[PDB]
Amino acid sequence: SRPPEGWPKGSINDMDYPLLGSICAVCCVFVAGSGIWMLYRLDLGMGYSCKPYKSGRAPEVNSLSGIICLLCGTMYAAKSFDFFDGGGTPFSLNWYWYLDYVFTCPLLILDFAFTLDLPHKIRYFFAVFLTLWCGVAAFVTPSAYRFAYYALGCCWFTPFALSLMRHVKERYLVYPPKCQRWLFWACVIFFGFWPMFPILFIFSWLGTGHISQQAFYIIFAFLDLTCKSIFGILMTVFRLELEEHTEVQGLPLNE
Amino acid sequence: SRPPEGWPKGSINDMDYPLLGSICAVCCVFVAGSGIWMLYRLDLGMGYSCKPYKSGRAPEVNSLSGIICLLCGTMYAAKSFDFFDGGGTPFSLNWYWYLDYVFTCPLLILDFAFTLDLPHKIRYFFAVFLTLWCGVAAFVTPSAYRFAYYALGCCWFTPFALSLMRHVKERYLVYPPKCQRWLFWACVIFFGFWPMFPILFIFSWLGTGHISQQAFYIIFAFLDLTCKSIFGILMTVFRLELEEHTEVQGLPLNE
Amino acid sequence: SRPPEGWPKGSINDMDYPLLGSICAVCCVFVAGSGIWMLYRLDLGMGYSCKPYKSGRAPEVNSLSGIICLLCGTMYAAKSFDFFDGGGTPFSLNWYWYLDYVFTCPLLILDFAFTLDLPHKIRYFFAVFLTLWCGVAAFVTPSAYRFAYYALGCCWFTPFALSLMRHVKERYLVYPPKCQRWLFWACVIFFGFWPMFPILFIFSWLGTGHISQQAFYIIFAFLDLTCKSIFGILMTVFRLELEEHTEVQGLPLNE
Ligand SMILES: *C/C=C(C)/C=C/C=C(C)/C=C/C1=C(C)CCCC1(C)C
Ligand SMILES: *C/C=C(C)/C=C/C=C(C)/C=C/C1=C(C)CCCC1(C)C
Ligand SMILES: *C/C=C(C)/C=C/C=C(C)/C=C/C1=C(C)CCCC1(C)C
């Protein structure tokens, strides 16, 4: 507890620290486990037939899905320690909302872009990075300028979102049906869930005031499990399907 | 105002926050606009004849000019919000001088090096990054060691500057006359203006004490407009000229 | 001295600041000198016979050894300034243990991996980065959770260490005897000294309490000289030997 006597009663920080700690310890194991599986299955070979790589090693970039999970899992361990130490600790990843995501979100979009061979990899990376930084600023600012920062971040996000939706619909047809399945669910996650983040900001204690900070933590735990683990599992299987088509069976894309 | 009652009268922080806010809001629009133009014109094709790219997309690195402007423009929006909120806000890019430049200056030098194909891209990047960090330290330190940090930064900068001047004069002759024009003005900016930054430090309130902090902000706004926007416009046109020569008209460099 | 009247007598901060300052000023010169030599010798050509590069420039990645030294040397200058200013200064690289290493350690492992062509360059980089971050957290935390953070970091380090040891033994045989000599001493440094860092944490004031913080600084100065300078000199000579074999004399590896 940052205050010597502990958090003032009825403060935004007056939460149920044990439950919070626990939820993150579970989030940690499951995300880290999924990441471990991801890197292990990448090392078996190419496709469901686990065809051996010619160089005897997998492409460097294919490791990102799994790395992102382990980075997230490591951060949720840290976060558990903070909650179990009662909150407001000197190395707290709970304190500055969105700072942890400044390290993962841009990696996620790289993962996605490398997997599909989207254009403008660098533009996409920076767009996400700036959006996340605007969130950090929005949460630490107490004036109304909090919303100036939120709007700046929407200025980045909205073009980014439309641009991506357009690019993805262009590559969708290239791929064979069986790969199209996995990509669709990946898109539901990206186009369905990413917009949830900025909508929660509005209903939080820093907006309308409908959702407490404790609730905010729990919701984000579920959102991170979906946007890192499930997303990574769907990226993995999309590559196994693709490889089976192109490498194991040696067939061409529609292009 | 960081102090509850506000900045002490006659302090370095006793400035004209509205005017400061405004200058940055304008700097923001103009820099962000220029960056937008830069990425748009890159997407039209190759050269003044807008020849279509073979891959149907432009090279990744060519996006840096434009990205650097948008990053700068986003930072000047943030800075506006701080000034209009009266200064000393929790997320202030005005507070720690030179911290914003730790993100742009090294990208600028990469942009320049990729464009000309200078050697030692990594050496050049680190040289700039360290110089900028020495500036950060020089400004936060109140002892005379402030000048120890300044000198350390000159130790990095001075070799870097001479090294670059030598490399650039080697590539200048390679290029055809029409491209040589644009490169010369780019060089005037780099060799004329970059040295201005360290000379202003000496005459600031942290050196001789001739230039107030308010003035320091205004001067830097003009310097950033020149070193990011105009520089980026000159990099853009140099590539359009070069492409017209090599790709549209298919002629060789002197080399 | 961070406290106005200065460090309380008999505090962990009640050290011999002048001696500390001096040790770092020497560490600074020697490391920076070694780095300078490294980049100079790289520019002479390929091998002991200094065969000219075909492109007329050396590979970008070969610069990392030397860059890492100069980055370390610049940081030890900063650290000298802090000690000579008596400690607890606003820009102190002495204050947060392990924060400086968050910038060098991952670069070191990249250097090593590029030199040997180890697989999983990105995995290796992140593994080191996370380990170092866990150290930072372990040192700032005052509860017992300090050890939770230490253990998390061992979870990263231990697999990383075994994985590397396995990969290196696979590449050792590839290389000719004369190169094998240099690689062995590089391995002694990596496998002998890297494990020293986490063992010192246990005997420090934050563990059993056998080694003072002053002593901790001195030990780390010697460890950094070994893990950056000597290591870099051994990487350099390994490349000169390798090049003499493969490029100057045009012979094949065992593979
Ligand atoms: C793993 C975490 C993910 C996928 C997080 C995504 C977060 C966003 C896309 C957040 C968006 C924001 C804005 C568009 C505006 C204000 C700030 C944010 C961060 C809430
Ligand atoms: C867009 C911003 C640019 C181009 C800034 C450039 C800044 C410098 C080259 C500053 C140089 C410095 C030194 C050489 C010594 C002390 C610290 C600085 C940052 C003032
Ligand atoms: C140039 C500096 C080097 C090579 C430093 C290496 C440091 C380590 C490998 C430190 C390891 C740690 C752990 C394994 C656990 C706790 C934290 C550390 C940083 C002491």
Residue numbers in the entry:
A (entry chain A), B (entry chain A), C (entry chain A): 6 to 260
Sentences from the paper on this structure:
KCR channelrhodopsins (K+-selective light-gated ion channels) have received attention as potential inhibitory optogenetic tools but more broadly pose a fundamental mystery regarding how their K+ selectivity is achieved. Here, we present 2.5–2.7 Å cryo-electron microscopy structures of HcKCR1 and HcKCR2 and of a structure-guided mutant with enhanced K+ selectivity. Structural, electrophysiological, computational, spectroscopic, and biochemical analyses reveal a distinctive mechanism for K+ selectivity; rather than forming the symmetrical filter of canonical K+ channels achieving both selectivity and dehydration, instead, three extracellular-vestibule residues within each monomer form a flexible asymmetric selectivity gate, while a distinct dehydration pathway extends intracellularly.
In contrast, the reason behind the significant enhancement of K+ selectivity we observed in H225 mutations remained unclear, as H225 is not directly involved in the selectivity triad. To address this, we determined the cryo-EM structure of the H225F mutant at 2.7 Å resolution and compared it to WT, initially observing no remarkable differences in the EV. While H225 is not part of the selectivity triad, it interacts weakly with W102 and Y222 due to its proximity. Considering that mutations in H225 might affect stability of the selectivity filter, we conducted additional MD simulations for both WT and H225F. Surprisingly, in simulations of the H225F mutant, Y222 occupies the tight conformation for a greater fraction than in WT simulations; simulations of the H225A mutant (also with greater K+ selectivity) using our homology model revealed the same trend. These results strongly suggest that the selectivity triad in HcKCR1 has intrinsic flexibility and that mutation to H225 stabilizes the architecture favoring K+ selectivity. However, a pronounced discrepancy was observed in K+ vs. Li+ permeability between WT and H225F (Erev for WT = −102.8 ± 2.7 mV vs. Erev for H225F = −119.2 ± 2.3 mV; p = 0.0035). These findings further support the idea that the selectivity conferred by the triad and its enhancement by H225F depend upon the hydration radius of cations entering from the extracellular side. The H225F mutant exhibited hyperpolarized Erev compared to WT (-69.6 ± 1.9 mV vs. -82.0 ± 1.9 mV; p = 0.0004) with only slightly decreased photocurrents and comparable kinetics in cultured neurons. Because of these potent loss-of-function properties, we name the H225F mutants of HcKCR1 and 2 as KALI-1 and KALI-2 (K+-selectivity Augmented Light-Gated Ion Channels).
